[PDB]
């Protein structure tokens, strides 16, 4: 079978802390 | 490879390649550690 993967699957990309920001 | 070879005779080699990520560090430099200091303006220097 087969499905929509929607907006899951994201991950820390780096051990450094961030926050209140938008970092691409 | 014979003792009588400069650019012919072997050398042995070793390549050390640091990582310097943003993990905790794991294989430290000889220097001595020291107590934290709060709310004073230091110098410090952590993992490097």
């Not at chain 2, 009588?4 to 005779?9: A, C, E, L, R, S």
């Not at chain 2, 080699?13 to 107590?35: D, I, Q, W």
Request: hydrophobic fraction near 35%; proline fraction near 7%; charge should be positive.
């Amino acid at each position: 079978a087969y499905t929509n993967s929607f907006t899951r699957g994201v991950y820390y990309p780096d051990k450094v802390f961030r926050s209140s920001v938008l970092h691409s | 490879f014979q003792p009588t070879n400069v650019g012919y005779q072997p050398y042995r080699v070793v390549v050390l390649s640091f990582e310097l990520l943003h993990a905790p560090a794991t294989v430290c430099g000889p220097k001595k550690s020291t107590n934290l200091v709060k709310n004073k303006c230091v110098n410090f220097n952590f993992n490097g």
